[PDB]
Amino acid sequence: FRDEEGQDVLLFIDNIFRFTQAGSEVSALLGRIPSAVGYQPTLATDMGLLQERITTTKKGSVTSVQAVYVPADDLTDPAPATTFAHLDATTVLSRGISELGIYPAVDPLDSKSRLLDA
Amino acid sequence: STPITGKVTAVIGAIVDVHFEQSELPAILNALEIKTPQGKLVLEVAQHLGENTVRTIAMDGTEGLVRGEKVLDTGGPISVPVGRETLGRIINVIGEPIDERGPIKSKLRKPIHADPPSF
Amino acid sequence: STPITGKVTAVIGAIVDVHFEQSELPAILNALEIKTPQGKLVLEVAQHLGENTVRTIAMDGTEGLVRGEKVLDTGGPISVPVGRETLGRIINVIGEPIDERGPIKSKLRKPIHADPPSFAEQSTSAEILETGIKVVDLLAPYARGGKIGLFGGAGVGKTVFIQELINNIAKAHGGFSVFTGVGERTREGNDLYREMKETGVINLEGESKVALVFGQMNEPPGARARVALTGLTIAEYFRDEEGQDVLLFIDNIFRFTQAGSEVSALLGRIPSAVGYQPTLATDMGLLQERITTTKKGSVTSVQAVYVPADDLTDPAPATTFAHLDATTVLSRGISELGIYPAVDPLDSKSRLLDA
Amino acid sequence: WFRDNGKHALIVYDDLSKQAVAYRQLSLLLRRPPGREAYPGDVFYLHSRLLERAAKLSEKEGSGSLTALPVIETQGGDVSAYIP
Amino acid sequence: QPTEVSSILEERIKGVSDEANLNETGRVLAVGDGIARVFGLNNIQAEELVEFSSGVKGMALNLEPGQVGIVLFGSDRLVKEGELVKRTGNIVDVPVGPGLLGRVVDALGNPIDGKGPIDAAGRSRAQVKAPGILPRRSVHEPVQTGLKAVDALVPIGRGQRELIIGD
Amino acid sequence: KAQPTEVSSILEERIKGVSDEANLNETGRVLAVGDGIARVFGLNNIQAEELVEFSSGVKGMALNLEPGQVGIVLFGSDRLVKEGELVKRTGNIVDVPVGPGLLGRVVDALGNPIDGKGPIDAAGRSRAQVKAPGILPRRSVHEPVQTGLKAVDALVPIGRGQRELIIGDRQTGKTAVALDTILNQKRWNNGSDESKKLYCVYVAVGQKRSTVAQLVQTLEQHDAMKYSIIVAATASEAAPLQYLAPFTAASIGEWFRDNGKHALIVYDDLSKQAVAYRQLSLLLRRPPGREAYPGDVFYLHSRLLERAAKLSEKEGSGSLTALPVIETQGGDVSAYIP
Amino acid sequence: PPPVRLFGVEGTYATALYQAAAKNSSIDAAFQSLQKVESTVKKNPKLGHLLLNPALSLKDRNSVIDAIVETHKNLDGYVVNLLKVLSENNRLGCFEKIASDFGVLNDAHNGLLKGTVTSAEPLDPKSFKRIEKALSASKLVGQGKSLKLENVVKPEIKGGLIVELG
Ligand SMILES: [Mg+2]
């Protein structure tokens, strides 16, 4: 849609983390030594290979929104932690603020974007 | 009858590997005996390793076990004396009394491996 | 005689596998010689892999190595030049002087792997080492032959404290000290060498009171794990020949621990801890048992100790603390404000502080 | 090249934790023995080799300098992790 | 049990047992996840660049006696089992010089900005030994970062290796 | 027909004793010296836990038995053993010289003297791994052992045959209390009453040759180097030595226990022996287990301690008092080994 | 395209030898030479299977592999290459031999000792495995009948067990 049609695209991927989860899933049986937190060794590699193809080129723009599931509400998990660097605008939804009744659940602190410039 | 003689091939800590001939393989959890100088050593068949080799668990210390030692198959799992005779007696894993009050005159020796009574 | 030769079969990073002929298989911890265009790389023998192939740990970088390259056996462990000729010289893990000041014309060259003095040779009674520093030998007296832990850092005068210890031990006693920098940064090491040149600790044209046998960080794992042994063997020769109260410095004992972890936990073995080697207590004992008091002399270790995550219960600081005799804490702020020698009078404890 | 030619040069390695992750990927895919957080045994050796090349040379070598600015991304402020 | 299983793990799987001559060239046995295990290359050096039949580059880390492990610089799709592999003859190197100023390059010095070829004064190996203790000077010149806090309380000097640690 | 005979004759040559003399039945050949455990081929007649000789003065114990090879753990530095070296069995289970001749003597983990005071007069050779006495031979502890500490004698009293733990963090006594106990045993050890005399033994796993040297000197100063035996497993000595030393001293004390005498044994820093066995285990490629320790570390400590008990009057009324020492982290009793 | 799969794991050598033979010729000649090798091995037991131990240097393995080379070069075809590559690899050489005979048996003879309930050994030498197994079973039940140790019919005990248990 972006390149051939030359149209603006909104690629909505809901919980992109399932891709890395499936990669780590098949890696164990693929004769691959598991990485930290029992992930695939190549997690950054294939995940970046996926993420970079989502980008705005000179032929079109892709306004992609990707949800990321953090295991155990742990923001230091390798998959989301490495996914952070592949993302322009970041919206972190923590369980703590949701527990206070704020249904959007977006933790205002780590929810940061590059556009936040004067 | 015809004794089932096995040869020790591996002694891994408390686990002993026994090799048999064709069609003399003891089943899983069968009791196997070796005539050690200190008495008798009981082996419970934990796994079948193939090629007529069984992986067994030792009921007593494995010191003094030489590879190739004769292994006798009891024909079934470990049998412990049962009944009111065993009352007041001290018994180890094997089933022999360790209370030094003579052998237990039990009429039956039920196997230690039994299925649950289901529903 | 005919030199024992071998061929390189595998090069897994810093791990090099060498195949020899029958009856020509070297014992482990031996030094294997290969001629490289860049320089003189040697390999220390690790566990035998069978089929007449030995796994080895590279003492230097492995770039350029070709499978089947000729490997020469030295017939024994790594041998470092030892004696007064090494004083004032900078020695790497392999014994080569990297100070480009010329070959070390030492009449003896002892292996870095030596069995520590037997129980009979051990000193029956613990003795105090007179370091000539008032704050040191009153609250945390230094154990003669003990393994003193220096808990300082940067900006607390650790380097000047080490130099003063060298000068005092060489003045009060023979005290031909030796500085062993495990995993030196090649900038702190250069700075330290420059300061000892400025002071009387190192005097190139005349006599020097210390030997800077240290290993840079850019060396492979095992090199940092054996520079300690090289300096240890130098101190051992000084103790067992001149009968001196030798003083040995380890720049960072935890760096030795982590180097031993990288060579002997992640290059063929299985970790048994937070990530250090399963043999952590074992190689710690090999290193620091050769530091003791014998009938002739005594080598005293002043090893700077770094505590990961400030965790005193950490198994590597637990092993190091399992034998430290006296500890010196060059505290940041509370002591250096005012008092120049620092040495926190309260946290500096000693096991010999008894009647 | 700048350092050995008498020129003073700054270098920002930036993320080396991601470089460490890539090296870990290579090591596990090469059946090398893993370690802390599955990292390779010589990843500290790797970082040491990388960082030691940046230094200030003496006047005899042209007085050039190479200033390194490595960047490590900590996970939740955990500076006690292996690569950090 | 007089005889136990002869083979447990085998690295050499070829059965012709003749005409090997794989000194400067090799053949892929297993390729996957960016790793191409290649039989042969008896004269390959450690982390030396190697060429595949598909044209993708690779540099060999693991040097097992039977096979040599090459990590692929590109997609593993182009590499297939049995593909011919030939040595480059040199360690990984990069074009270096003043022409790289104002240019964006990849991990091998290839210009990725599309501004033209890189003017190379020379080529230096990526893996080169760091300067020794003696060819160094104490850090004295300042690296003025322009940050008040950084330049005031944690100064950076020429030749230093200051770490920008943080979340 | 003659060509096969000549082939056989020349085949028996160039191979040495692998299939020509002794057939590697009593002898053998090293396959590969592992991380700390040498994979040894041959030794067809070897048994489990059998002491072996590596022809270089290094002892070995058979923990790994396979139908093709036998894995031997190295009692010492693995440098002295090479691949393909000649290895022969000692013909017996791992044994320890025991008797009253070890009184006033310090030995290694295998009973070899280390003080250089001549050979040891041993009444017998007790196996390192001896099954603990059963229910009947044991008797409820009733005789007292006086340590000399008011806080330990009056409160938390220890009796002969009791296994009493000493827990400390780094330097909070631990071996100190054992020393006051050892010196207090001198009050009755000088007497002629065998029942009240306590022939103590000491274990020094993970400790320094210097610390044990000072310990022996202090014992000699207080005239305690006459009824006390010290087994030294220095941190320099290999992990198998640190593993064996507690069992060595257990056999030493069990000699007194079986012969009607009363003995006390101090397993000093059993945590160091635990880490030594941990090192040995993951050198055997054993599972890391629970909190880095092998799953049988509890079995190790339990079979080690159970040998210390108060025997009944039928078995000579002997006793073996155990004083194990655990070095903890931050005064923690909730760690695995404690 | 070998007739039967050994699935590797110590069986790759037999498949490699069979492929090398099927490339040009000597499906049989190499095989009777290999059978002669095995016969010579069993002829001297202490000298024919003790020598196949892993604890043996490459030079002495080579000396042994020349030792089996005897009796007017009965070693023919690619068998010599198999011994040469086994000298530098896994040494002992019996199961891959059995795998070789089993592979050639499937290639040219196609026999198997089935019978389900019958505990017999009706080996059949024929590639068309449709009806000749019945003839083999009839011959086996006719003549021979040496042991016939059926070890209790399984259908009877199975049916009884499901009947009592419901
Ligand atoms: Mg103590």
Side-chain angles (χ1 to χ4, degrees), chain C residues 25 27-28 47-48 50-52 77 116-117 119 122 124 268-269 271-272 278-279 282 286 289 313 321 323 351, chain F residues 32-35 78-79 82-83 114 170-171 208-210 212-214 217 234 236 278-279 282 285 292 329:
Chain C
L25 192 137
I28 43 186
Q47 76 260 19
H48 302 151
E51 159 292 328
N52 280 242
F119 179 83
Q122 296 281 332
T124 51
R269 308 191 166 75
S272 84
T279 74
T282 292
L286 280 293
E289 273 299 285
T313 78
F321 272 71
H323 41 289
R351 290 175 78 106
Chain F
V33 179
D35 273 302
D78 36 5
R79 168 180 189 288
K82 292 179 176 179
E83 160 178 351
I114 56 172
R170 283 265 321 289
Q171 278 88 236
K208 323 302 222 183
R209 260 173 204 169
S210 63
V212 185
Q214 282 116 33
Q217 185 52 48
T234 317
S236 66
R278 180 187 57 187
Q279 160 186 345
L282 318 98
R285 317 299 295 201
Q329 317 298 130

Side-chain angles (χ1 to χ4, degrees), chain B residues 10 12 15-18 44-49 53-57:
Chain B
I12 284 323
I15 292 179
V16 182
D17 275 356
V18 189
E44 156 168 49
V45 183
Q47 323 183 320
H48 272 215
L49 300 190
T53 294
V54 290
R55 197 176 286 277
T56 64
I57 311 204

Side-chain angles (χ1 to χ4, degrees), chain F residues 42-288:
Chain F
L43 273 304
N44 308 317
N45 202 36
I46 207 143
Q47 55 209 1
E49 281 276 320
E50 169 167 1
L51 225 38
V52 84
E53 260 297 288
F54 272 103
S55 83
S56 76
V58 179
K59 304 282 182 183
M61 161 180 97
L63 263 206
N64 228 15
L65 268 77
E66 182 256 320
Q69 66 191 355
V70 48
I72 305 300
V73 67
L74 275 299
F75 284 141
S77 161
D78 36 5
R79 168 180 189 288
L80 297 172
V81 54
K82 292 179 176 179
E83 160 178 351
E85 260 184 1
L86 188 31
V87 50
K88 58 198 165 55
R89 60 197 292 248
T90 65
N92 48 2
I93 311 297
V94 175
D95 47 325
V96 168
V98 291
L102 283 87
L103 291 180
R105 205 70 197 272
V106 54
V107 308
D108 67 343
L110 267 172
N112 307 313
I114 56 172
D115 40 6
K117 288 202 278 190
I120 301 165
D121 179 60
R125 302 197 60 74
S126 288
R127 263 155 43 175
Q129 304 282 344
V130 164
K131 184 62 67 64
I135 296 285
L136 277 156
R138 290 163 171 258
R139 186 251 189 278
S140 61
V141 167
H142 74 277
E143 306 185 7
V145 54
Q146 290 109 315
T147 79
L149 292 316
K150 306 159 209 155
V152 154
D153 291 331
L155 178 55
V156 191
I158 320 157
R160 278 155 200 254
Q162 182 180 359
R163 306 165 289 132
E164 187 65 27
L165 182 33
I166 316 175
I167 293 271
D169 226 5
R170 283 265 321 289
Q171 278 88 236
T172 82
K174 284 189 286 180
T175 191
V177 181
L179 267 293
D180 321 65
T181 316
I182 288 304
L183 301 189
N184 197 27
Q185 297 329 294
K186 178 174 70 65
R187 310 297 180 92
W188 307 266
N189 269 274
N190 312 318
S192 54
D193 200 347
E194 219 58 20
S195 70
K196 307 215 77 182
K197 280 209 285 185
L198 194 74
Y199 296 102
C200 329
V201 80
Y202 186 85
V203 199
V205 314
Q207 276 157 257
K208 323 302 222 183
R209 260 173 204 169
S210 63
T211 47
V212 185
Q214 282 116 33
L215 182 32
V216 169
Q217 185 52 48
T218 49
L219 289 176
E220 194 88 52
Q221 286 168 357
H222 299 105
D223 209 352
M225 262 315 317
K226 172 249 289 177
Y227 53 88
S228 66
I229 304 82
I230 295 97
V231 301
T234 317
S236 66
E237 294 154 24
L241 279 304
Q242 309 187 36
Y243 163 100
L244 199 32
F247 297 101
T248 326
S251 303
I252 297 298
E254 275 184 308
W255 184 95
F256 297 101
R257 188 203 61 196
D258 305 335
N259 286 114
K261 300 174 183 296
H262 306 259
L264 182 170
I265 170 167
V266 177
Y267 296 100
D268 183 315
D269 305 309
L270 259 187
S271 56
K272 303 223 192 314
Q273 186 251 1
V275 317
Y277 183 79
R278 180 187 57 187
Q279 160 186 345
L280 173 54
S281 74
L282 318 98
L283 273 36
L284 309 193
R285 317 299 295 201
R286 301 281 177 78

Side-chain angles (χ1 to χ4, degrees), chain C residues 185-247:
Chain C
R185 297 181 179 187
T186 324
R187 189 205 62 80
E188 290 185 353
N190 193 37
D191 280 27
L192 189 66
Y193 177 55
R194 183 183 47 75
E195 321 293 32
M196 321 205 188
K197 285 196 289 188
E198 281 161 28
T199 72
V201 180
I202 282 178
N203 162 34
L204 306 170
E205 57 271 354
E207 61 93 21
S208 299
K209 296 177 277 292
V210 76
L212 281 276
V213 47
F214 51 69
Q216 301 99 298
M217 270 166 164
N218 43 297
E219 292 167 320
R224 303 181 298 280
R226 298 291 185 271
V227 288
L229 278 83
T230 61
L232 180 100
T233 294
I234 287 162
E236 273 179 315
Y237 175 31
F238 271 113
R239 143 159 64 76
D240 299 318
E241 188 79 51
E242 278 77 10
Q244 277 153 10
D245 289 342
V246 192
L247 154 55

